[PDB]
Amino acid sequence: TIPHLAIDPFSLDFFDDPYPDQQTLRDAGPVVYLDKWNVYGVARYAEVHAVLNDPTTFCSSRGVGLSDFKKEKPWRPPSLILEADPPAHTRPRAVLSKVLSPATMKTIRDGFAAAADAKVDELLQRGCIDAIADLAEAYPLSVFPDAMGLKQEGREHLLPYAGLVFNAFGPPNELRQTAIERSAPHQAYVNEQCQRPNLAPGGFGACIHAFTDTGEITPDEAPLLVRSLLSAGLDETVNGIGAAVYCLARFPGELQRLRSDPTLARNAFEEAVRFESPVQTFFRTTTREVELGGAVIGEGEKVLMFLGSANRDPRRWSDPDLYDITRKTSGHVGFGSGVHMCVGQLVARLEGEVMLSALARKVAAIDIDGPVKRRFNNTLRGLESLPVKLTPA
Numbered sequence: 503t504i505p506h507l508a509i510d511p512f513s514l515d516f517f518d519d520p521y522p523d524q525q526t527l528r529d530a531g532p533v534v535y536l537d538k539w540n541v542y543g544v545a546r547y548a549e550v551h552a553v554l555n556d557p558t559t560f561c562s563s564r565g566v567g568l569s570d571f572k573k574e575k576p577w578r579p580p581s582l583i584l585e586a587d588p589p590a591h592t593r594p595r596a597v598l599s600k601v602l603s604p605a606t607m608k609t610i611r612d613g614f615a616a617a618a619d620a621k622v623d624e625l626l627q628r629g630c631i632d633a634i635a636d637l638a639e640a641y642p643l644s645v646f647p648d649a650m651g652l653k654q655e656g657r658e659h660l661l662p663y664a665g666l667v668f669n670a671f672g673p674p675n676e677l678r679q680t681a682i683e684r685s686a687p688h689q690a691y692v693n694e695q696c697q698r699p700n701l702a703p704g705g706f707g708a709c710i711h712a713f714t715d716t717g718e719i720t721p722d723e724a725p726l727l728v729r730s731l732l733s734a735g736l737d738e739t740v741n742g743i744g745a746a747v748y749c750l751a752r753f754p755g756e757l758q759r760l761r762s763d764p765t766l767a768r769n770a771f772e773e774a775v776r777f778e779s780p781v782q783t784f785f786r787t788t789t790r791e792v793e794l795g796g797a798v799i800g801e802g803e804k805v806l807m808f809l810g811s812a813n814r815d816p817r818r819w820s821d822p823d824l825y826d827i828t829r830k831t832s833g834h835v836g837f838g839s840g841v842h843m844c845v846g847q848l849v850a851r852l853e854g855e856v857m858l859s860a861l862a863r864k865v866a867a868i869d870i871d872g873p874v875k876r877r878f879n880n881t882l883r884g885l886e887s888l889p890v891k892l893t894p895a
């Protein structure tokens with residue numbers, strides 16, 4: 503009933519161009535079995551959405567990577583929020599919801615937008631830049647560690663730690679094992695920055711620790727919750743911004759539209775998240791036998807959701823492979839869906855919006871003028887290097 507496929511969704515060959523293989527996964531059926539890793543796969547929008555919105559049946563507490571925590575030790579203590587199910591999930595989720603709240607965005611927006619405008623001004627002075635290192639990476643590094651309240655020393659550890667976390671979701675291939683091999687110093691830095699004295703007042707980290715007063719989290723829970731914001735947030739936002747620039751470079755008509763109406767900045771970033779889906783994949787584990795799209799999956803089985811494929815499923819999207827900054831993007835799963843939907847999505851959309859706004863107001867053209875190079879990660883899709891020439895407006 504269920505087709506078996508030999509496609510390795512974590513192969514370098516696959517990362518180089520996933521889109522043909524994703525149609526193959528979508529069209530083979532609503533539920534596939536991937537023989538290479540012994541997991542079920544769902545690549546159509548409808549089934550991905552169904553799995554995300556039934557956390558009771560498709561739990562996260564047994565891990566959202568390939569590894570099943572009922573069978574193997576996690577490579578690090580479990581996240582109190584990503585790797586938890588309701589009800590244990592609920593109060594740490596509420597805390598991070600308040601730490602990264604609609605009202606909190608007001609406190610940071612002016613400084614985030616000023617840093618984005620200043621970065622664009624700086625890059626226009628240079629002309630030909632690397633839109634990854636010099637923009638997609640430089641800008642979040644210039645705002646988020648400060649907004650966290652991190653000290654300056656040691657920040658070189660943040661990007662290697664983030665890439666490790668997302669490689670560790672993958673299967674035990676060389677990408678993952680090389681990442682854990684090099685992990686000890688980055689792990690040591692992050693855990694130490696999670697302690698309350700090392701987090702500057704008014705920042706996200708201090709604010710998490712302040713919630714230990716309310717009964718929502720205990721003092722001994724705060725460091726692990728801070729860890730969440732030093733694990734998630736950087737690489738996806740970097741890849742999202744780099745994806746936006748990439749699209750604006752390859753689809754100049756959309757840059758011209760954005761220039762003519764800079765208020766499209768926020769949706770242009772959201773369309774970039776759907777179009778490239780920085781978070782490509784996530785696992786769930788069945789807590790029972792379940793019927794999913796005509797297929798029967800037993801208990802304790804790993805289910806791989808293809809988020810990026812779901813975002814390009816023609817059964818849901820008109821012209822899915824076109825970048826359209828006026829698309830009705832509501833309902834894409836680039837941030838997930840349901841109880842675990844990205845709690846930091848307001849931070850990400852804010853960083854993305856103000857950067858695209860600065861480009862929309864300050865740049866006339868963005869032209870690729872060098873070899874484009876892809877960055878390989880078990881879970882993240884993004885670019886290594888994007889040489890562009892910026893033309894001032």
Ligand code: HEM
Pocket residue numbers: 562566583584585595598602730731734735736738739742775779780781784809835836837838839841842843844845846847849850
């Ligand atoms: C373009 C940027 C981003 C993308 C594409 C993205 C993607 C995602 C996705 C797909 C999930 C779902 C996890 C699941 O369903 O198991 C998630 C959850 C999460 N994200 Fe984001 N994220 C982004 C930015 C951020 C930022 C900026 C932060 C923090 C400031 C953050 C923190 C978190 C946390 C803590 C969770 C776990 C939430 C929970 O389990 O309830 N993310 N993210």
Ligand SMILES: [Cl-]
Pocket residue numbers: 578689692
């Ligand atoms: Cl760790």
